[PDB]
Amino acid sequence: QNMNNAGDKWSAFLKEQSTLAQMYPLQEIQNLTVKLQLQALQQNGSSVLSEDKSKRLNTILNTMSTIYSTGKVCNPDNPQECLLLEPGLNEIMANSLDYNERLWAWESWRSEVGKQLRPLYEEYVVLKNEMARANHYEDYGDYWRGDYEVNGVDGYDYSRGQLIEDVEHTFEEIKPLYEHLHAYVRAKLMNAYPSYISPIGCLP
Amino acid sequence: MLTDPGNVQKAVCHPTAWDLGKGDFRILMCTKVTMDDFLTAHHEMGHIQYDMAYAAQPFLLRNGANE
Amino acid sequence: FVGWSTDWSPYADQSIKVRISLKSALGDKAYEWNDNEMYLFRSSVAYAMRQYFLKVKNQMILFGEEDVRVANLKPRISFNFFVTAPKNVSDIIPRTEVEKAIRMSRSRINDAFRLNDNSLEFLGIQPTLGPPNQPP
Amino acid sequence: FVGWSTDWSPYADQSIKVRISLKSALGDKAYEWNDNEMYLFRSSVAYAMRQYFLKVKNQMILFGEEDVRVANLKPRISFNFFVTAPKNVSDIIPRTEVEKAIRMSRSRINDAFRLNDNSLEFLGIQPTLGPPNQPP
């Protein structure tokens, strides 16, 4: 807190000085040495929010992390032979190279975690959204991209709704590199695993 | 703090680096005597050399660009 | 070989296309098929498993209409469907027993919608009946 | 006034007695009604609400056969029944709309058991059809 609440003695002092810095635009300043300064100005934490129910959400957040870290599947051939995700389940994908047991290990692992964390998810979306709306943004996934909201050198900017459009200008030409690779592994998956794979269609 | 060879002694734990401003760049490491600190050593020394640019430069002038 | 077929699955083989032609048995002046008749069907599909698995397999397993999975709904009363386990949804019903399961109660479902088995098309299941004995 | 009538409820008014006479339409040589034909019926009862509430009430509410509540099962396939909400079971369906709901698909269910509406008795619902026009 000596960095958050003693940041808040400066964050409350920021709301005297940041507003006295908040009369300057983002594009008619080119100094740079002071342009990004007001872009790092909403930083010091979310002191514009009255955080009382974002400090309710951390009670949910520790429950989300505990079940994933304790993600485990007890095997049914003998019920108290159990394997966690990290030393028991990725090893099955590593050591075992069978179709059907890895097919079981794929399905039995996914029948554990996301169902228990689905009621930890719907309220997690919406409460982060008014957290984002009190952070004066449309969604917290936009804030995720808010570090990429650098509008500084008139051509050097990077809108939030354009940074992925150029990414879909990439992989559709890498998609034929997958297409040979798809047919490459479909030439492999017929004699590596017992012939379930359509050599025309998609992958399991 | 560097001390955690195998002990349960009360200290927080990660190999982490800092730019404090005002000419101060700290490390914090949780040394279970292992190679992951030297994995981060030049990894931070590539990144704290960006931080040596904002040695005395403000909180409003933070890390480099993106993550 | 370029691309892929973007809709294949290794469980698509167990799905059955059913094909309803209302202009063939009831013809015109008939009722307009909508999402109720979708919902009527899956109930009456679930029928056929309960009648099969205790008169043939001879143990009870429960079935809701939601176990009848519906895919590619066509206003032309046509869609490929398959049924699963009720809530052991990791496992589905093998189609090889569903083929005999329909043929047992095929006569039950056409009059459940005033149809004639040429409006109950299954593409793999066809009626195998009808020897006549008119002369003494 | 001594005692009480030990079976009255304030929701018994919404229950409908249905009365099946197999010796009237199929007569003899017919199939013996049992708990399957109980279970066939409630599925085909649930039919009539889905066909009503979207062709008349025009919004979707789902119905299982278990929503069709069965009371006083008698051999003569006679029993008073009513239907509820699916799992808002605090509330039930008002009978006043069920009366028009049966009269819409009354013709659907008699041939669903080879019956003649004199083996589909409802005691409050009767067929109101049949004008003839034989001469040109």
Coordinates of C-alpha atoms in Angstrom, one line a residue:
Chain A
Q1 CA 0.0 0.0 0.0
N2 CA 3.0 2.3 0.6
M3 CA 2.9 2.2 -3.3
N4 CA -0.8 2.2 -3.8
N5 CA -2.2 4.2 -0.8
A6 CA 0.9 6.2 -0.6
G7 CA 0.4 6.3 -4.3
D8 CA -3.1 7.5 -3.4
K9 CA -1.7 10.4 -1.5
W10 CA -0.2 11.3 -4.8
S11 CA -3.2 9.9 -6.8
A12 CA -5.5 12.2 -4.9
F13 CA -2.8 14.9 -5.6
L14 CA -2.8 13.7 -9.2
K15 CA -6.5 14.7 -9.5
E16 CA -5.4 18.2 -8.6
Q17 CA -2.4 18.1 -11.1
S18 CA -3.6 15.8 -13.8
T19 CA -6.7 18.0 -14.4
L20 CA -4.3 20.9 -14.5
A21 CA -2.5 18.8 -17.0
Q22 CA -5.8 17.9 -18.7
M23 CA -6.2 20.8 -21.0
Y24 CA -3.8 19.5 -23.7
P25 CA -4.6 17.4 -26.7
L26 CA -3.1 14.2 -28.0
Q27 CA -2.3 15.2 -31.6
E28 CA -1.4 18.9 -31.6
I29 CA 1.4 18.2 -29.2
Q30 CA 4.5 16.7 -30.9
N31 CA 7.1 17.5 -28.1
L32 CA 7.1 13.7 -27.3
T33 CA 9.2 14.3 -24.1
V34 CA 5.8 15.3 -22.7
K35 CA 3.3 13.7 -25.1
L36 CA 3.3 10.3 -23.6
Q37 CA 3.4 11.8 -20.1
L38 CA -0.4 12.4 -20.2
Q39 CA -0.8 8.9 -21.7
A40 CA 0.9 7.5 -18.6
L41 CA -1.3 9.7 -16.5
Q42 CA -4.3 7.4 -16.0
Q43 CA -1.6 5.1 -14.4
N44 CA -1.0 4.8 -10.7
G45 CA -4.0 2.6 -10.4
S46 CA -7.8 2.9 -10.9
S47 CA -8.4 5.7 -8.4
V48 CA -11.3 7.1 -10.4
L49 CA -13.5 4.1 -9.7
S50 CA -14.4 3.8 -6.0
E51 CA -12.9 0.2 -6.0
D52 CA -15.2 -1.4 -3.4
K53 CA -16.6 -4.2 -5.6
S54 CA -13.4 -4.6 -7.6
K55 CA -12.0 -5.6 -4.2
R56 CA -14.9 -8.0 -4.0
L57 CA -13.9 -9.6 -7.3
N58 CA -10.5 -10.8 -5.8
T59 CA -12.5 -13.3 -3.7
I60 CA -13.7 -14.8 -7.0
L61 CA -10.3 -14.5 -8.6
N62 CA -8.5 -16.7 -6.0
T63 CA -11.2 -19.4 -6.4
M64 CA -10.5 -19.3 -10.2
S65 CA -6.8 -19.8 -9.7
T66 CA -7.1 -22.6 -7.0
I67 CA -9.1 -25.0 -9.1
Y68 CA -6.8 -24.6 -12.1
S69 CA -3.7 -25.1 -10.0
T70 CA -5.5 -28.1 -8.4
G71 CA -6.7 -29.3 -11.8
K72 CA -6.6 -33.0 -11.4
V73 CA -8.2 -36.2 -12.8
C74 CA -8.3 -39.3 -10.8
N75 CA -8.1 -42.3 -13.1
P76 CA -11.1 -44.7 -13.2
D77 CA -9.2 -48.0 -13.7
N78 CA -8.3 -47.7 -10.0
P79 CA -10.0 -44.8 -8.4
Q80 CA -7.2 -43.6 -6.0
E81 CA -4.6 -43.4 -8.7
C82 CA -4.8 -39.7 -9.4
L83 CA -2.9 -37.3 -11.7
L84 CA -2.8 -33.5 -11.6
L85 CA -2.6 -31.4 -14.7
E86 CA 1.0 -30.4 -14.5
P87 CA 2.9 -33.6 -13.4
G88 CA 0.3 -36.1 -14.6
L89 CA -1.7 -34.9 -17.6
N90 CA 0.8 -33.1 -19.9
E91 CA 3.0 -36.2 -19.3
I92 CA 0.3 -38.3 -20.8
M93 CA 0.4 -36.1 -23.9
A94 CA 4.2 -36.4 -23.7
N95 CA 5.0 -40.0 -22.7
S96 CA 2.0 -41.8 -24.0
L97 CA 1.5 -41.7 -27.8
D98 CA -1.8 -43.6 -28.1
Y99 CA -4.8 -42.3 -29.9
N100 CA -7.6 -43.5 -27.5
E101 CA -6.0 -43.0 -24.1
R102 CA -4.9 -39.5 -25.1
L103 CA -8.4 -39.1 -26.4
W104 CA -9.6 -40.2 -23.0
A105 CA -7.1 -37.9 -21.3
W106 CA -8.2 -35.0 -23.5
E107 CA -11.9 -35.5 -22.7
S108 CA -11.6 -36.5 -19.0
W109 CA -9.4 -33.4 -18.3
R110 CA -11.9 -31.1 -19.9
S111 CA -14.8 -32.6 -17.9
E112 CA -13.3 -31.0 -14.7
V113 CA -12.4 -27.4 -14.7
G114 CA -14.3 -25.0 -17.0
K115 CA -17.6 -26.3 -15.8
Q116 CA -16.7 -25.4 -12.3
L117 CA -15.3 -22.0 -13.4
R118 CA -18.2 -21.1 -15.7
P119 CA -20.2 -19.6 -12.7
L120 CA -17.0 -17.7 -12.0
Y121 CA -17.1 -16.2 -15.5
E122 CA -20.3 -14.4 -16.4
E123 CA -20.2 -12.0 -13.5
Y124 CA -16.4 -11.7 -14.1
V125 CA -17.1 -10.3 -17.6
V126 CA -19.7 -7.8 -16.6
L127 CA -18.2 -6.5 -13.4
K128 CA -14.9 -5.9 -15.3
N129 CA -17.0 -4.0 -17.8
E130 CA -18.4 -1.3 -15.5
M131 CA -14.9 -1.4 -14.0
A132 CA -13.8 -0.5 -17.5
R133 CA -16.7 1.9 -17.8
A134 CA -15.5 3.6 -14.6
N135 CA -12.1 3.4 -16.2
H136 CA -13.9 5.3 -19.0
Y137 CA -13.6 2.5 -21.6
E138 CA -16.1 0.3 -23.4
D139 CA -14.5 -3.0 -22.2
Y140 CA -11.6 -4.2 -20.1
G141 CA -10.4 -6.2 -23.2
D142 CA -10.0 -2.7 -24.8
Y143 CA -8.0 -1.6 -21.8
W144 CA -5.9 -4.7 -22.5
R145 CA -5.3 -3.0 -25.8
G146 CA -5.0 0.4 -24.1
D147 CA -1.3 0.1 -23.9
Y148 CA -1.4 -0.1 -27.7
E149 CA -3.4 3.1 -27.9
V150 CA -0.3 5.2 -28.7
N151 CA -1.2 8.1 -30.9
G152 CA 2.0 10.1 -31.0
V153 CA 4.0 10.6 -34.2
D154 CA 1.3 11.1 -36.8
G155 CA 1.6 7.8 -38.6
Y156 CA 3.1 6.1 -35.6
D157 CA -0.2 5.7 -33.9
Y158 CA -2.1 2.4 -33.5
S159 CA -5.9 2.4 -33.3
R160 CA -7.5 -0.4 -31.3
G161 CA -9.6 -1.4 -34.2
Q162 CA -6.8 -1.7 -36.7
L163 CA -4.1 -3.6 -34.9
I164 CA -5.7 -7.0 -35.6
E165 CA -6.9 -6.2 -39.2
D166 CA -3.2 -6.2 -40.3
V167 CA -2.9 -9.5 -38.4
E168 CA -5.6 -11.0 -40.6
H169 CA -3.5 -9.8 -43.5
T170 CA -0.9 -12.4 -42.4
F171 CA -2.1 -15.9 -41.7
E172 CA -4.3 -16.4 -44.7
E173 CA -1.1 -16.7 -46.8
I174 CA 0.3 -18.8 -44.0
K175 CA -2.9 -20.8 -44.4
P176 CA -1.6 -22.6 -47.5
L177 CA 1.6 -23.3 -45.5
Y178 CA -0.8 -25.0 -43.2
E179 CA -2.6 -26.7 -46.1
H180 CA 0.5 -28.5 -47.2
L181 CA 1.2 -29.2 -43.6
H182 CA -2.3 -30.4 -43.1
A183 CA -1.9 -32.9 -46.0
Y184 CA 1.6 -33.6 -44.6
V185 CA 0.3 -34.7 -41.2
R186 CA -2.7 -36.3 -42.8
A187 CA -0.2 -38.4 -44.7
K188 CA 1.3 -39.0 -41.3
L189 CA -1.9 -39.5 -39.2
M190 CA -3.1 -42.4 -41.3
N191 CA -0.2 -44.7 -40.2
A192 CA 0.8 -43.0 -36.9
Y193 CA -2.7 -43.3 -35.5
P194 CA -5.2 -46.0 -36.5
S195 CA -6.9 -44.4 -39.5
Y196 CA -9.7 -42.3 -38.1
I197 CA -8.5 -39.2 -39.8
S198 CA -10.0 -38.1 -43.0
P199 CA -7.1 -37.2 -45.3
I200 CA -9.3 -34.5 -46.8
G201 CA -10.9 -33.1 -43.7
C202 CA -10.0 -31.4 -40.4
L203 CA -8.0 -32.7 -37.5
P204 CA -8.9 -34.3 -34.2
Chain B
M1 CA 16.4 -10.0 -0.5
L2 CA 18.0 -12.9 -2.2
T3 CA 17.6 -15.7 0.4
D4 CA 15.6 -18.8 -0.3
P5 CA 17.9 -21.8 -0.8
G6 CA 15.2 -24.2 0.5
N7 CA 13.9 -22.3 3.4
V8 CA 10.4 -21.3 4.6
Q9 CA 11.6 -17.9 5.8
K10 CA 9.2 -15.0 5.3
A11 CA 10.0 -13.2 2.1
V12 CA 8.1 -12.7 -1.2
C13 CA 9.4 -14.7 -4.1
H14 CA 10.1 -14.0 -7.8
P15 CA 13.2 -13.0 -9.7
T16 CA 12.0 -9.5 -10.5
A17 CA 13.5 -6.2 -11.6
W18 CA 12.7 -2.5 -11.0
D19 CA 12.9 1.0 -12.2
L20 CA 12.3 3.2 -9.2
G21 CA 13.0 6.5 -10.8
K22 CA 15.4 9.1 -9.4
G23 CA 18.3 7.0 -10.4
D24 CA 17.4 3.6 -8.8
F25 CA 16.9 0.2 -10.5
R26 CA 16.4 -2.6 -8.1
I27 CA 16.4 -6.3 -8.4
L28 CA 14.5 -8.7 -6.2
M29 CA 15.3 -12.4 -6.4
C30 CA 14.2 -15.6 -4.7
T31 CA 17.4 -17.6 -5.0
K32 CA 16.7 -21.3 -4.6
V33 CA 20.3 -21.3 -6.0
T34 CA 19.2 -21.9 -9.5
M35 CA 19.7 -20.9 -13.2
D36 CA 16.4 -19.1 -13.6
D37 CA 18.0 -15.9 -12.1
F38 CA 20.7 -15.9 -14.7
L39 CA 18.0 -16.6 -17.3
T40 CA 16.6 -13.3 -16.2
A41 CA 19.9 -11.6 -15.7
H42 CA 20.9 -10.4 -19.2
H43 CA 17.1 -10.6 -20.0
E44 CA 16.7 -7.8 -17.5
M45 CA 20.0 -6.2 -18.5
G46 CA 18.6 -5.8 -22.0
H47 CA 15.5 -4.3 -20.5
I48 CA 16.9 -2.2 -17.7
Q49 CA 19.2 -0.6 -20.2
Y50 CA 15.9 0.8 -21.5
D51 CA 15.2 1.7 -17.9
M52 CA 18.6 3.5 -17.6
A53 CA 17.1 5.9 -20.1
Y54 CA 14.3 6.8 -17.7
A55 CA 16.7 6.8 -14.6
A56 CA 15.5 10.2 -13.4
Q57 CA 12.7 10.6 -15.9
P58 CA 9.2 10.7 -14.4
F59 CA 6.5 8.2 -13.5
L60 CA 4.8 9.8 -16.5
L61 CA 7.7 8.4 -18.5
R62 CA 7.5 4.6 -17.7
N63 CA 8.9 1.4 -19.3
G64 CA 9.6 1.1 -23.0
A65 CA 7.0 0.2 -25.6
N66 CA 4.3 -2.4 -25.1
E67 CA 5.2 -5.7 -23.4
Chain C
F1 CA -4.2 -31.5 -51.9
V2 CA -5.3 -27.9 -51.2
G3 CA -7.4 -26.8 -48.3
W4 CA -9.7 -29.1 -46.3
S5 CA -13.4 -30.0 -46.1
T6 CA -14.4 -27.6 -43.4
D7 CA -17.2 -29.7 -41.9
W8 CA -15.9 -33.2 -41.4
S9 CA -15.9 -34.8 -38.0
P10 CA -15.1 -38.4 -36.8
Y11 CA -18.6 -38.5 -35.3
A12 CA -20.4 -37.1 -38.4
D13 CA -20.7 -40.7 -39.6
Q14 CA -23.1 -41.5 -36.8
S15 CA -25.4 -38.6 -37.7
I16 CA -28.5 -39.5 -39.7
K17 CA -30.1 -37.2 -42.2
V18 CA -33.8 -37.2 -41.9
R19 CA -35.8 -35.8 -44.8
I20 CA -39.4 -34.7 -44.4
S21 CA -41.6 -33.9 -47.4
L22 CA -44.9 -32.4 -46.3
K23 CA -46.0 -32.0 -50.0
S24 CA -45.9 -35.8 -50.4
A25 CA -48.1 -37.4 -47.7
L26 CA -50.3 -34.6 -46.3
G27 CA -49.5 -32.5 -49.4
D28 CA -51.2 -29.1 -49.3
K29 CA -53.7 -27.7 -46.8
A30 CA -51.3 -29.2 -44.3
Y31 CA -49.8 -27.5 -41.2
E32 CA -46.8 -25.2 -41.5
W33 CA -43.7 -26.9 -40.0
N34 CA -41.9 -24.7 -37.5
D35 CA -39.7 -24.9 -34.3
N36 CA -42.5 -26.6 -32.4
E37 CA -42.5 -29.4 -34.9
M38 CA -38.7 -29.4 -34.3
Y39 CA -39.5 -29.8 -30.6
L40 CA -42.2 -32.4 -31.2
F41 CA -39.8 -34.5 -33.2
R42 CA -36.9 -34.8 -30.7
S43 CA -39.4 -35.9 -28.0
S44 CA -40.7 -38.6 -30.4
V45 CA -37.1 -39.5 -31.4
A46 CA -36.3 -40.0 -27.7
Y47 CA -39.3 -42.4 -27.7
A48 CA -37.6 -44.8 -30.1
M49 CA -34.6 -45.3 -27.9
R50 CA -36.6 -46.1 -24.7
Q51 CA -38.7 -48.6 -26.7
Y52 CA -35.6 -50.1 -28.1
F53 CA -33.2 -50.4 -25.2
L54 CA -35.6 -52.2 -22.9
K55 CA -37.4 -54.4 -25.5
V56 CA -34.0 -55.3 -27.0
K57 CA -31.1 -54.2 -24.8
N58 CA -33.3 -54.8 -21.7
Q59 CA -32.0 -52.2 -19.2
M60 CA -33.3 -48.7 -18.5
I61 CA -31.5 -45.6 -19.7
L62 CA -33.3 -42.3 -19.7
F63 CA -33.6 -39.9 -22.6
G64 CA -34.6 -36.3 -23.0
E65 CA -35.4 -34.6 -26.3
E66 CA -32.2 -32.5 -25.8
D67 CA -30.1 -35.7 -26.3
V68 CA -31.4 -35.7 -29.9
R69 CA -28.9 -33.3 -31.4
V70 CA -30.1 -31.2 -34.3
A71 CA -27.8 -29.9 -37.0
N72 CA -28.3 -28.0 -40.2
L73 CA -32.0 -27.1 -39.9
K74 CA -33.5 -26.7 -43.3
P75 CA -36.9 -25.0 -43.8
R76 CA -37.4 -28.0 -46.1
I77 CA -37.9 -30.2 -43.0
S78 CA -34.4 -31.8 -43.5
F79 CA -31.4 -31.9 -41.1
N80 CA -28.8 -34.4 -40.1
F81 CA -29.3 -35.6 -36.5
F82 CA -27.8 -37.9 -34.0
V83 CA -28.5 -38.8 -30.4
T84 CA -26.1 -39.0 -27.5
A85 CA -26.1 -40.5 -24.0
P86 CA -28.4 -38.4 -21.7
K87 CA -25.6 -36.6 -19.6
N88 CA -22.7 -38.9 -20.2
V89 CA -22.2 -36.6 -23.2
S90 CA -18.6 -37.7 -23.5
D91 CA -20.1 -40.8 -25.1
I92 CA -22.8 -41.0 -27.8
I93 CA -25.0 -43.8 -29.0
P94 CA -23.5 -46.0 -31.8
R95 CA -25.5 -45.6 -35.0
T96 CA -25.4 -49.3 -35.8
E97 CA -28.1 -49.9 -33.1
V98 CA -30.0 -46.8 -34.0
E99 CA -30.6 -48.3 -37.5
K100 CA -32.5 -51.3 -36.0
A101 CA -34.0 -48.9 -33.4
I102 CA -35.8 -46.9 -36.1
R103 CA -36.9 -50.0 -38.0
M104 CA -38.7 -51.3 -34.9
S105 CA -40.8 -48.2 -34.4
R106 CA -40.7 -46.8 -38.0
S107 CA -44.5 -47.4 -38.2
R108 CA -45.0 -45.4 -35.0
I109 CA -43.8 -42.0 -36.2
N110 CA -45.3 -41.5 -39.6
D111 CA -48.8 -41.5 -38.2
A112 CA -47.4 -39.3 -35.5
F113 CA -47.3 -36.6 -38.2
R114 CA -49.7 -38.1 -40.8
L115 CA -46.8 -39.3 -43.0
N116 CA -46.1 -42.2 -45.3
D117 CA -42.4 -43.3 -45.1
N118 CA -41.8 -41.4 -48.3
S119 CA -42.0 -38.4 -46.1
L120 CA -40.0 -40.2 -43.5
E121 CA -36.7 -40.5 -45.4
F122 CA -33.6 -41.7 -43.6
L123 CA -31.1 -42.5 -46.4
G124 CA -29.9 -45.8 -45.1
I125 CA -33.2 -47.0 -43.6
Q126 CA -36.1 -48.1 -45.9
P127 CA -39.3 -50.1 -45.3
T128 CA -38.9 -53.8 -45.9
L129 CA -42.5 -54.9 -45.5
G130 CA -45.6 -55.9 -47.4
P131 CA -46.2 -59.4 -48.7
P132 CA -49.8 -59.7 -50.0
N133 CA -52.1 -62.8 -49.6
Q134 CA -55.4 -61.9 -51.2
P135 CA -56.4 -65.3 -52.7
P136 CA -57.6 -68.1 -50.5
Chain D
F1 CA -71.6 -29.4 8.6
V2 CA -69.7 -32.5 9.6
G3 CA -66.3 -33.5 8.3
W4 CA -64.8 -32.4 5.0
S5 CA -64.4 -33.6 1.5
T6 CA -60.9 -35.1 1.8
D7 CA -59.8 -34.4 -1.8
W8 CA -60.6 -30.9 -2.7
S9 CA -57.9 -28.5 -3.8
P10 CA -58.1 -24.9 -5.2
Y11 CA -56.2 -26.2 -8.2
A12 CA -58.4 -29.2 -8.8
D13 CA -60.6 -27.1 -11.0
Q14 CA -57.9 -26.8 -13.6
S15 CA -57.5 -30.6 -13.8
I16 CA -59.2 -32.3 -16.7
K17 CA -60.6 -35.8 -16.6
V18 CA -59.8 -37.7 -19.7
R19 CA -61.7 -40.9 -20.4
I20 CA -60.5 -43.5 -22.8
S21 CA -62.7 -46.3 -24.0
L22 CA -60.8 -48.9 -26.0
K23 CA -63.9 -51.0 -26.4
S24 CA -65.5 -48.2 -28.4
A25 CA -63.2 -47.3 -31.3
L26 CA -60.7 -50.1 -31.6
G27 CA -63.0 -52.4 -29.6
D28 CA -61.6 -55.9 -29.1
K29 CA -58.4 -57.4 -30.6
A30 CA -56.9 -54.1 -29.5
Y31 CA -53.7 -53.5 -27.6
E32 CA -53.7 -53.7 -23.8
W33 CA -53.2 -50.3 -22.3
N34 CA -50.4 -50.1 -19.7
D35 CA -47.9 -47.7 -18.2
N36 CA -46.2 -47.3 -21.6
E37 CA -49.5 -45.9 -23.0
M38 CA -49.5 -43.7 -19.9
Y39 CA -46.0 -42.5 -21.0
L40 CA -47.0 -42.2 -24.6
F41 CA -49.9 -40.0 -23.7
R42 CA -48.0 -37.3 -21.6
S43 CA -45.5 -36.9 -24.5
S44 CA -48.5 -36.4 -26.9
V45 CA -50.1 -34.1 -24.3
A46 CA -47.0 -32.0 -24.2
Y47 CA -47.3 -31.8 -28.0
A48 CA -50.5 -29.9 -27.8
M49 CA -49.1 -27.0 -25.7
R50 CA -46.1 -26.4 -28.0
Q51 CA -48.4 -26.4 -31.0
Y52 CA -50.7 -24.0 -29.2
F53 CA -48.4 -21.5 -27.6
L54 CA -46.5 -20.6 -30.8
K55 CA -49.3 -20.8 -33.3
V56 CA -51.5 -18.8 -30.9
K57 CA -49.5 -17.3 -28.0
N58 CA -46.5 -17.0 -30.4
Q59 CA -43.6 -17.4 -28.0
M60 CA -41.6 -20.5 -27.1
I61 CA -41.9 -22.3 -23.8
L62 CA -40.6 -25.9 -23.5
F63 CA -42.6 -28.8 -22.2
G64 CA -41.6 -32.3 -21.0
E65 CA -44.0 -35.2 -20.5
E66 CA -43.5 -34.9 -16.7
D67 CA -45.2 -31.5 -16.8
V68 CA -48.4 -33.4 -17.6
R69 CA -49.4 -34.4 -14.1
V70 CA -51.2 -37.6 -13.8
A71 CA -53.7 -38.3 -11.0
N72 CA -56.1 -41.2 -10.1
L73 CA -54.9 -43.7 -12.7
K74 CA -57.7 -46.1 -13.5
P75 CA -57.7 -49.2 -15.8
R76 CA -60.2 -47.6 -18.1
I77 CA -57.4 -45.3 -19.0
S78 CA -59.4 -42.7 -17.1
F79 CA -57.7 -40.2 -14.9
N80 CA -57.9 -36.5 -14.1
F81 CA -54.9 -34.6 -15.4
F82 CA -53.5 -31.1 -15.6
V83 CA -50.3 -29.6 -16.9
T84 CA -47.9 -27.2 -15.2
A85 CA -45.2 -24.8 -16.2
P86 CA -42.0 -26.9 -17.1
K87 CA -39.9 -26.0 -14.0
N88 CA -41.6 -22.9 -12.8
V89 CA -43.7 -25.4 -10.9
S90 CA -44.9 -22.7 -8.5
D91 CA -47.2 -21.7 -11.4
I92 CA -49.4 -23.9 -13.5
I93 CA -51.1 -23.5 -16.9
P94 CA -54.6 -21.9 -16.7
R95 CA -57.2 -24.4 -17.9
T96 CA -59.1 -21.8 -19.9
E97 CA -56.4 -21.8 -22.6
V98 CA -56.0 -25.5 -22.4
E99 CA -59.6 -25.9 -23.5
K100 CA -58.9 -24.2 -26.8
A101 CA -55.5 -25.9 -27.0
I102 CA -57.1 -29.3 -27.1
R103 CA -59.7 -28.2 -29.6
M104 CA -57.0 -27.2 -32.0
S105 CA -55.2 -30.5 -32.1
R106 CA -58.1 -32.8 -31.0
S107 CA -57.9 -34.4 -34.5
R108 CA -54.3 -35.1 -34.0
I109 CA -54.5 -37.5 -31.0
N110 CA -57.3 -39.9 -31.8
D111 CA -55.5 -41.3 -34.8
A112 CA -52.4 -41.3 -32.5
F113 CA -54.2 -44.2 -30.8
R114 CA -56.7 -45.2 -33.4
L115 CA -59.6 -43.5 -31.6
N116 CA -62.7 -41.6 -32.5
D117 CA -63.4 -38.8 -30.0
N118 CA -66.0 -41.0 -28.3
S119 CA -62.9 -42.7 -26.9
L120 CA -61.3 -39.3 -26.4
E121 CA -63.7 -38.0 -23.7
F122 CA -62.8 -34.7 -22.0
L123 CA -66.0 -33.7 -20.2
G124 CA -66.0 -30.1 -21.1
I125 CA -64.5 -30.5 -24.6
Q126 CA -66.6 -31.9 -27.4
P127 CA -66.2 -32.0 -31.2
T128 CA -68.0 -29.1 -32.9
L129 CA -67.5 -30.1 -36.6
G130 CA -69.1 -31.7 -39.6
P131 CA -71.3 -29.7 -42.0
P132 CA -72.2 -31.9 -45.1
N133 CA -72.4 -30.6 -48.6
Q134 CA -73.2 -33.7 -50.8
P135 CA -75.5 -32.2 -53.5
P136 CA -74.2 -29.9 -56.2

